[PDB]
């Protein structure tokens, strides 16, 4: 408890409202449950929806793991981890194995998520079809109408415009076989990991104030065509540190002339492999 | 050696400016500048007072060759720090005597239609402020009419009576004779009677 | 006393904190008689800055400048211009400049007055620079988002 | 029959007495010193020094104390004090390359010569009120590292030697001085910069933020932020050579504001410049952005938004003028309002009855 | 946009330690307390309270102390701290007729029922720096008069009872709350006033100054300025009756603006409105002027000045948004600039071989 | 008609000073076993203002508001709402609110606690009004 | 008599520049002469231009009269007069006929001014076309070319909308038959007093950095149409104090009921009428 502040930095009213919204979202997998909180200014862009969920669901006994693009060394991830250490005092770990709360931005950890874990995803936009439908009045109703063919248009025309499905980030999915949800801009590599995961996944968008959750062991399938099944391009380049190419690789720039290298995005799995 | 300046520069400059303002706002009125007791010869008392109370670094001064003495230049750039130019067109305060020529008069700066105050002021030293051609003055500063007979050069008389430079362009003339000073702004209508 | 040496000791005096200069000068106890040609005057100095640091000049405001000038019995004129408004400091700097213009005090003050002050300033600079370097950073960026 | 009486001077004297009583506040507390404001309210002092026009920390702190913390009032106090003092000299153009860096960062290059240096900053901090500051305390002992500073040439020097930018070369032109003559629009870049350095930081920050709307998500980059001590020296006529009169803590921002393709010239990155007293980083960046926006006429651009309108921006940038002419409505205006009342009464009596 | 950056934890912590040690300043001087700041720098606290949005003197003074006197950073701190508090109630609408006046003036008449009560004000002071404040002293003794407040009816009540102006009637419309839902333009007048009260003082001052100089003139008259304590009341659910929870020191500005000629109503004056915490009144006057300027759609008058532009005025008045925008540009964008370098270089090759 | 009196003494408590109220309550040496059913909580109160002072409502920021509740042994509930963040002050105000509803303390505390506090506040308000009215500008005066 | 500051608080360079500006203004009657105005102890928009003009002009032998809204008892007038007393130590009078330098805000004295008197006006907006054209870059050219037709169009539009000219104070005038000049924010009631006045009129816009003047016996003609002549403010009531009927009156609301009293703005003239029997 930070002096002068509530536990987890949020007033209990916002916590209670977000908790009620989380319960409704769990009872309705894939549905972007609205919640009517206030406006909270934060320095780092990440947090308008993820920090709120973490504060709503974090407890004194939790172990927090903050991840930015899979990494824990990121400046924003370190800042958020320190912020939650200050306002909650929870323990923090660098291992997906020992973590009980994993706040991540645009990345699922390589390590399988076990039971008694919650993973929170920051969602810049909670409705994928905002790029097509400008007015939200039809967007809400078409979910009940099940008119999910409109979002299939971009998938259909991606191959026409480029020859292959290039939507490797924020690829839409259908969860529970009913609700079309768009996760955070996680890579196509991690989209399979959402299929019947042992852990409870929470998605929170702040600038839109919509929450949706994926209960553990919930069937979520990538949206594609039978003639063009959802496939993830295998990686043919290794990691410059541990070498293993079984994990999604991000790029780190080393110089001002464009020089760079590929390293495992999930630094925890990278360290696990390196120490092997 | 350098010519001295106002004994009380602040008070003397204030009084000189008030006399000059009286002369300027009411054209044709002769006023006496009794604050400086010895002008910088060839410059008389009134011309020296005007220069000391108005000239400074910002205002280039052009002295006509008859008045362009050495000690006067030294004292002028020491007491006022005013730039000393060699051509009439570069001057803010032109100083001349009866020997003024038409070319010099027309070279001076009359200002611009958008910045009419960016012109020059001609500080003319005349033989006398009376006894010349009888001149009738009408305009701002003159209730009904005024009569003055300064001994003006023919070129300056033509300038005043004809005004080749339309308003707001024109040179404000300051006639000086010893300690006495008369002013004709560019807005004064002058006829030779 | 070449121009460079006078510039050096004048800069050292100007950058010296008024308190340290006063204390060290009083400890020196080498006091002479001098006539203040120009009473310590505080005015403004117009700051000229450059566009981009190297381009055309503009006026970046003003700073206070306290100037003083001193004369010695033997006719050596000393001067000082120092940012601030401490008139006593300005006249003291002018005094030391006048004293160091003459061989009587030049070598002594250069060896025991100017050098200690410059060394103190260098020590303060070094300590501050070390604690600032404690915050030296090397950021590594990542492509995409 | 309501004989008029005098109560004006005795009104204003009592009002000023009440204002000074309010300034002193509760007497059970020690009266805060000018030195405390200078040392601890150092960013307010930096703003007052920058906008008031006198780089004198003690004077700015005194103005803040006398203004009851009102930054605009302190700025105007310092600006009015400027008239009291005489211009003793004009320094040589400042050399920001010789700065003793308290802080030096760049958002464009990682490996800048001299190294990145975060220095003292509020960046990356959590905006959590430190309630332990409600009571006495002391800051943590400062960590220490190597005590040497490497040479730190400007980032835009690198950009210019790479052909991506144009080096700002002095042509010997005499800078304009708005303090000597009134502004005459259109203004030279020197006049615009001088006015901007005196401009209210909130207004300039809002203008810089509004310039964002002009383009999309490709925001400018802080090519180099550099805060540290610059030596001030003058060439007095009594000596003829340069004398090092002191040093000033200043912040210099050079913003990379995107590239343009001038005709008959290779495209290059346009740059904005901001120079402030003290560590007024936000003000320096806003000044750089507004300077780049006001560079429209010389780049052959069209003003799309008020921020690029030279006259509107500069005429109202000065804090003292805006504050004075808005507060002057508190002056009596019953003569003017009576003239309005008479006309409205006549209009009402004719529109209806 | 968002460049992920790694490897600065040690440097960031060192920078924060440096910033806190500089905020504390020289430890020889005492530590500038928060009670001292709120009592003696009261106008800075007024501005920070008004813009941040919490009318707590001590919290605003603490935020100012933490920010080393910076008003924008203090506003950020207070605005963020507002998030950790629970909304316990909504007060009854303020009744400024019951204000306990510390100051009250009217520029539209020579004298009015109640009198021209100057109160504490820097107006009519000669802004000559007071160097005695460089040391301690004693506040002046306050001359006393009749310890009574005469009926001070609002001047606009007087103008409306003459038919020269219209009473502001309550239609019962529910006020908009930007602190719950982001504004959508065009926004109702209540939303506009709420945003104006939170806007940067130095930017709304400049907009009001622009309107005065002729960029969207509204012919303003300071119809009334009031500063005093207003009782705040709530109606708790536990109870059923209104309870009084305390009093707030606030300033109210009612501007008399140019008259109009409605098609089927007698000509009358228009009016702006401003309302701020504390006794910082220029903010209230600027708020009233910009309120009248933004009332253009209400009166059907096409905008001719930037101050009449609703989106321009309101989208950039927030200090927090503009400060965050400017701070982002400082963050390492090494990758993004490398993209720009390649884009620029291709243009250089295509247009110059 | 006890609502008006309860409002009066609640306002006298809230408008009081924590130092004054605490000192007077300690001097009274009056205390009854009570339990804090609601712990003193400091949050926000939204400020509601009127356009032109009399027109439509708009929101004019927030203030800090502290509230506490106390239940006495007999079950009387005392509440408090005071601007600021002084939680002990709010608890004391709630305790006095509860006590003033007991017939044993109503008249006694009104004579010894509420009326003196109101008198002190009125005295300082009158003094401040005198100091402020010293700044009045006089133009015309009746003459006989 | 100065307490540290130079006489009149301004250095000699500033006053010399202002004096050159005044001379140019007198030589070009009605034209706005720019000058390098300095920041004064009074905030911009509170009379800094008039203060600087008086400081440049005033001398030790002058009797300064400072009136705002026609009265010497106004708070701003009190402050300006006290400042000038501190920095000059000159004689100060409330009688217009006894004054040598008169600094006014929004009022021309009811008493006619004599030959040697200088009246200095405080001007917020030196440009008469500022409200029609906010930009100085355009009004400077409009004055250069004498393109004043837009002011006539403004008067025409006022007539069309209301049937009366809307401008009531700061009523634009034509000076010396050439320059459309903005007077002070004086009532149009005072406009006729500027025509062929025997006193020198100075106009200081300190915040706007402009000085202009009207020489003695200079034609001043308020703008108007032939069928809509120039008319001045008139009240159905005399003064409630001196019974005057030719002085600019002002309202003083007495009580909340709505009882009014009209009394002279020019308090010196009011006192003259009251002591000399009654009107
Ligand atoms: O800019 P400055 O300092 O010369 O102020 C001149 C005039 O501008 C304001 O407007 P106002 O006429 O109502 O009275 C004030 C003041 O007298
Ligand atoms: Zn790896
Ligand atoms: Zn006005
Ligand atoms: Zn970015
Ligand atoms: Zn009368």
Short description:
The structure is cut from a larger assembly and holds two copies of chain A, one copy of chain B (193 residues), two copies of chain C and two copies of chain D (353 residues). By secondary structure, chain A is of the alpha/beta class.
Notes on the structure:
It is classed as transferase. Keywords: transferase, ABC, hydrolase, lyase. The entry is titled "E. coli C-P lyase bound to a PhnK ABC dimer in an open conformation". Chains A, G: Alpha-D-ribose 1-methylphosphonate 5-phosphate C-P lyase. Organism of A, G: Escherichia coli. This is part of a larger assembly, with two copies of chain A, one copy of chain B (193 residues), two copies of chain C and two copies of chain D (353 residues). Chain A has helices spanning 12-27, 50-57, 75-88, 136-145, 152-162, 267-275; strands at residues 33-34, 63-68, 91-92, 101-105, 118-122, 173-175, 179-181, 200-205, 210-214, 220-222, 249-253, 260-264. Chain A is an alpha/beta fold and 276 residues long. Chain B has 193 residues and is α/β, with parallel strands linked by helices. Chain B has one domain: Rossmann fold, CATH 3.40.50.11310. Helices cover 27% and strands 20% of the residues of chain B. Chain B contains five helices and nine strands; from the N terminus they run H-E-H-E-H-E-H-E-E-E-H-E-E-E. In chain B, the strands form two sheets. Chain B has a six-stranded mixed sheet. In chain B, strand 7 and strand 8 form a beta hairpin. Chain C has one domain (1-145). In chain C, 48% of the residues lie in helices and 30% in strands. Chain C is extended. Chain D is an alpha+beta fold. Chain D folds into two domains: 1-88, no CATH class; 89-318, no CATH class. In chain D, strands 3-5-6-7 form a four-stranded antiparallel sheet. In chain D, a hairpin with an 8-residue loop joins strand 5 and strand 6. The longest helix of chain D is centred in the last third of the chain and has 18 residues, at 334-351. At the D-E interface, helix 1, helix 2, helix 3, helix 4 and helix 5 of D face helix 1, helix 2, helix 3, helix 4 and helix 5 of E. Strand 4 of chain C pairs antiparallel with strand 4 (116-117) of chain D.
């Amino acid at each position: 408890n930070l002096s002068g502040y509530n536990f987890a930095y949020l007033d209990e009213q916002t916590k209670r409202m977000i908790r009620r919204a989380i319960l409704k979202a769990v009872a309705i997998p894939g549905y972007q449950v609205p919640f009517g909180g206030r406006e909270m200014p934060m320095p780092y862009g990440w947090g308008t929806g993820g920090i709120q969920l973490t504060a709503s669901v974090i407890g004194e006994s939790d172990v927090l793991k903050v991840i930015d693009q899979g990494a824990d060394d990121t400046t924003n991830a370190v800042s958020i981890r320190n912020f939650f250490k200050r306002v909650t005092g929870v323990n923090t770990t660098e291992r997906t194995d020992d973590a009980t709360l994993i706040q991540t931005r645009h990345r699922i950890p390589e390590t399988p998520l076990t039971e008694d874990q919650i993973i929170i995803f920051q969602v810049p936009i909670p409705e994928p079809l905002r790029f097509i439908e400008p007015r939200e009045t039809e967007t809400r109703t078409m979910h009940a109408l099940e008119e999910y063919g409109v979002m299939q248009v971009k998938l259909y025309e991606d191959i026409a415009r480029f020859g292959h499905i290039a939507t490797t980030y924020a690829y839409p999915v259908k969860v529970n076989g009913r609700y079309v949800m768009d996760p955070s801009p996680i890579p196509k590599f991690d989209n399979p990991k959402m299929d019947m995961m042992p852990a409870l996944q929470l998605f929170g968008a702040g600038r839109e104030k919509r929450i949706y959750a994926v209960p553990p062991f919930t069937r979520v399938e990538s949206l594609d065509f039978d003639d063009h099944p959802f496939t993830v391009q295998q990686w043919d380049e290794p990691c410059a540190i541990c070498g293993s190419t079984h994990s999604y690789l991000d790029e780190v720039v080393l110089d001002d002339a464009g020089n760079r290298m590929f390293v495992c995005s999930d630094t925890d799995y990278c360290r696990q492999q390196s120490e092997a | 050696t350098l010519e001295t300046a106002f004994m009380l520069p602040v008070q003397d400059a204030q009084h000189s400016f008030r006399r000059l303002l009286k002369a300027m706002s009411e054209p044709g009125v002769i006023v006496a500048l009794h604050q400086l007791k010895r002008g910088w010869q060839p410059l008389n008392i009134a011309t020296t007072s005007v220069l000391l109370t108005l000239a400074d670094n910002d205002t280039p001064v052009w002295l006509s060759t008859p008045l362009n003495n050495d000690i006067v230049n030294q004292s002028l750039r020491f007491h006022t720090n005013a730039p000393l130019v060699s051509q009439p067109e570069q001057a803010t305060f032109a100083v001349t005597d009866e020997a003024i020529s038409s070319e010099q008069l027309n070279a001076l700066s009359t200002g611009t239609a958008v910045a009419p105050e960016a012109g020059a002021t001609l500080i003319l030293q005349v033989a006398s402020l009376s006894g010349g051609r009888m001149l009738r003055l009408t305009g701002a500063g003159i209730a009904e009419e005024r009569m003055i007979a300064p001994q003006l050069p023919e070129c300056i008389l033509h300038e005043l009576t004809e005004r080749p430079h339309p308003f707001p362009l024109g040179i404000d003339l300051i006639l000086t004779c010893g300690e006495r000073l008369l002013a004709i702004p560019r807005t004064t209508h002058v006829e030779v009677c | 006393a070449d121009t460079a040496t006078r510039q050096h000791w004048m800069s050292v005096l100007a950058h010296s904190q008024p308190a340290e200069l006063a204390a060290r000068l009083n400890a020196l106890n080498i006091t002479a008689d001098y006539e203040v040609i120009r009473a310590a005057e505080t005015g403004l100095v117009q700051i000229q800055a450059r566009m981009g640091g190297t381009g055309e000049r503009f006026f970046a405001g003003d700073a206070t400048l306290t100037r003083a000038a001193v004369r010695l019995t033997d006719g050596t004129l000393g001067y000082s211009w120092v940012l601030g408004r401490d008139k006593q400091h300005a006249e003291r700097c002018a005094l030391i400049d006048a004293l160091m213009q003459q061989s009587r005090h030049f070598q002594n003050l250069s060896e025991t007055l100017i050098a200690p002050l410059d060394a103190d300033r260098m020590a303060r600079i070094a300590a501050r620079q070390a604690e600032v370097n404690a915050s030296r950073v090397d950021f590594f960026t990542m492509v995409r988002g | 029959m309501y004989v008029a009486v005098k109560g004006g001077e005795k009104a204003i004297d009592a009002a000023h007495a009440l204002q000074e009583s309010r300034r002193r506040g509760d007497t059970d507390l020690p009266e805060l010193s000018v030195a405390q404001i200078e040392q601890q309210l150092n960013l307010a002092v930096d703003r007052v020094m920058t906008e008031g026009g006198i780089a004198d920390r003690e004077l700015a702190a005194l103005a803040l104390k006398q203004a009851s913390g009102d930054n605009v009032e302190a700025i105007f106090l310092l600006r009015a004090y400027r008239t009291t003092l005489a211009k003793l000299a004009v320094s040589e153009p400042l050399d920001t390359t010789g700065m003793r860096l308290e802080r030096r960062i760049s958002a464009v290059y990682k490996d800048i010569p001299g190294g990145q240096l975060l220095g003292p900053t509020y960046d990356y901090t959590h905006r959590l009120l430190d309630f332990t500051l409600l009571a006495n305390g002391e800051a943590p002992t400062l960590t220490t590292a190597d005590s040497e500073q490497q040479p730190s040439p400007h980032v835009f020097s690198l950009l210019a030697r790479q052909g991506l930018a144009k080096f700002e070369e002095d042509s010997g032109a005499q800078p304009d001085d708005i303090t000597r003559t009134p502004p005459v629009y259109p203004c030279s870049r020197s006049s615009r910069l001088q006015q901007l350095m005196r401009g209210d930081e909130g207004y300039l920050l809002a203008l810089a933020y509004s310039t964002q709307r002009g383009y999309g998500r490709n925001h400018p980059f802080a090519g180099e932020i550099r805060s540290g001590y610059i030596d001030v020296s003058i060439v007095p006529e009594e000596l003829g050579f340069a004398v090092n009169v002191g040093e000033l803590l200043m912040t210099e921002c050079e913003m990379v504001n995107g590239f343009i393709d001038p005709p008959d010239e290779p495209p290059h990155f346009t740059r904005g410049y901001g120079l402030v007293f003290g560590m007024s980083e936000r003000k320096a960046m806003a000044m750089a952005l507004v300077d780049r926006a006001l560079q429209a006429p010389e780049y052959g651009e069209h003003a799309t938004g008020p921020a690029q309108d030279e006259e509107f921006v500069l005429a109202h940038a000065d804090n003292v003028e805006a504050a004075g002419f808005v507060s002057h409505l508190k002056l009596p205006h019953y003569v003017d309002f009576q003239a309005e009342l008479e006309l409205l009464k006549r209009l009402q009596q004719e529109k209806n009855h």
